[PDB]
Structures are given as structure tokens and as C-alpha cells.
């Protein structure tokens, strides 16, 4: 199962209007092509598993990319979904989403929901209707400046840092010490567990500079089903791609890993950055993986729009082989 790479273009921000930028990016959903106008203020075309226009709705993404994958979670296969791109291109919007402000929508009925709310809701829905003894445990670890933080725990201070060591009896696996896996009774529990985590994030933005921009958010869900069956979904929200070129250790390392795998060069540097070691099976491994790439249409972001694209195209080539748990 080759890694699924899919490109998502968001509408022009007011900031791009004020930078004067015109539109350099055309998204073709049918042909699944992205075309970038490099030449002037003539074009380059790329072909991805999916292409998502500026008109893409959150549920759309959920259906095309996420639903199939969660279906493969029920079978007990581990799966990872990356969200990659330049800051402000929409990575957090995809992984999380937002509430409609003047609307009365319940978070489960809200059009603006990103992948995480949606998935969490559905697991309870589908598996209640299935009704077979499921239990859910969700942890979230953010990597900043090569340090590990557990957001989810209430009892821990925002500052405290976990320790990671190569897994015993796994080797491929890694153990993050003191990472809280907080079992979820129900969705109305989901909202609280995530909400406190958002409060911790607000505290830690003040603690660290350009936190929101340089951090990697690794969200993990582990479902226990009876019959036994175990499934694990990693929703990863990467630090902005802009720092990367054609700084961030873990991000730079992720690029190196993708490059090595596509290249076929002998050494792939899993060891170097926390993200690659934790997410090691996500890359050239037994975990089914997809990548949502994110880009801006406006001309001023062109070098970045190209960089993002170059990674995804390259990452298309990489070979994955997923297996049931
Ligand atoms: C429909 C909706 C409503 C509020 C939000 C929102 O702003 N946040 C913050 C939600 C949110 N917070 C998160 C915090 C962390 Cl640390 C990691 C992930 C999330 C996340 O995914 N969300 C979205 C959400 C919404 C409803 C239920 C669960 C998750 C919380 C109110 C739950 C997002 C989507
Ligand atoms: N497809 C989209 N449609 C409308 N607004 C979007 C879309 N993608 C991103 N945005 C908005 O653009 C801004 C940047 O979003 P964010 O997801 O934080 O980017 P990133 O996390 O990649 O830096 C936010 O105001 C966000 O709500
Ligand atoms: Cl705007
Ligand atoms: Cl949307
Ligand atoms: Mg972000």
C-alpha cells in the first residue's frame, strides 16, 4: 500500500490580498492535478492521489481520505495521517477545525470540524451500532525544539517533559515515559479532554516563541475491540514546512527520511529526530499512511507552495506494507 498523498488548497486570505498577490495555483479534482504558475507575475503540473479545490468542505476531506482509513482501523491496522505545509496554509484547520461562531451547532454537527472531532464521534457511533465491547484511549504528545510534552494530562504542569527510549521487545517501537493515555467514556467526554488540552496550549504559546508554528502535534487514538482486535490512529499535525528548504531537527529529519526512502539510498535516519523514531512505522513500514499536503494559492508563497509540492510528489513514491494487529 503506497503512502496516499493528497493536496489541499485553501482560499485566498485577506493577508494575501494585502500583499497584493494574484492566484498562481489551479486545482483539478477530476484529473487530480495541481498546476503552479512559476513563470510570471509558464506552469508546472503535479499528479496526486487527490486534489482538493478552494471549495473543499471539511466533511469532503473526511469522506475521501479519513473514512476509509478509520474503516481500516476497525480491522486493527495501525494508520497515520500527516498534515504537511507552510504555516497558515490550513494544517490545524484540517486536523482540528473550528466551531461556527454565530451558529448553534453542536460540535458533532458543526460543518467546520476538522478530522479529530469527526473521527472521535464516529468511532463511538459506528462501534455502538456494532456494539462489541470497544474501549478507547487517546494520548497527545507535542514535540517542540526536540522536547516531548504531554498535553492531555490535567495533573501535570504544562512545562514538564517526558523521556523517550527505544522500545523493549519492539525495537521499531518507542516508549514515551509518563505519556497519559486517557480513556474516553463518551464523546461528551471527548470535548472536555481536548478542551483542557487547548487551555494548556494557550499557556504554552506564552511559554515558548512561535510555539504554534514550530511545534509538531502527535495525536494518538487506540481502540480496543472484542471478538481480540486492536487499532491505532495517529493524527499528526506537523510544524510549518516553511523552515524546510527545497532550524527544525524533527521536520528536517522527516524530509531526509522521505528523501532516503524515495531515493533508495542505504541509510534512512530514523534515529536522529524524536518524530521519525516515534512515527517510524508511519514511513516505509507496516502502518497504512496518508499525507494531506497544504498550500497557498497566492504568488508570494510560491517558493513555499513549490517546496510543499516537491515533498509530496517525492513522498508519493515511498513503499508501505500495512498489517493487522
Ligand atoms: C467544532 C469545533 C469546535 C471547537 C473547536 C476548538 O476550537 N477546539 C479547541 C476544540 C479542539 N481542541 C483540541 C485541542 C487539542 Cl490539544 C488537540 C485537538 C483538538 C481538537 O481537535 N479540537 C476539535 C474538537 C472539537 C470537538 C470535539 C473534539 C475535538 C476543543 C473545544 C475540543 C474545534 C472544532
Ligand atoms: N480550506 C479553508 N477554508 C477556509 N479557511 C481556511 C482553510 N484552511 C485554513 N483556513 C484558515 O486560515 C488560517 C490558518 O489556518 P491554520 O489551519 O492554523 O494553518 P496552519 O495550522 O497550517 O498554520 C486560519 O484562520 C484558518 O481557519
Ligand atoms: Cl481572510
Ligand atoms: Cl471548510
Ligand atoms: Mg497550526
Author numbering: 17 to 57, 62 to 247, 256 to 274, 288 to 366
The authors write:
Human Eg5 (KSP, kinesin spindle protein, KIF11), a member of the kinesin-5 family, is a well characterized mitotic kinesin that is required to establish a bipolar mitotic spindle. Eg5 forms homotetramers that can attach to neighbouring antiparallel spindle MTs and slide them against each other, thus separating the duplicated centrosomes. Loss of Eg5 function owing to RNA interference or small-molecule inhibitors results in the formation of monoastral spindles, cell-cycle arrest and apoptosis. A number of small-molecule inhibitors of Eg5 have been identified, including MK-0731, pyrrolotriazin-4-one-based inhibitors and the quinazolin-4-­one-based ispinesib, all of which are allosteric inhibitors that bind to the unique L5 loop region of the catalytic domain.
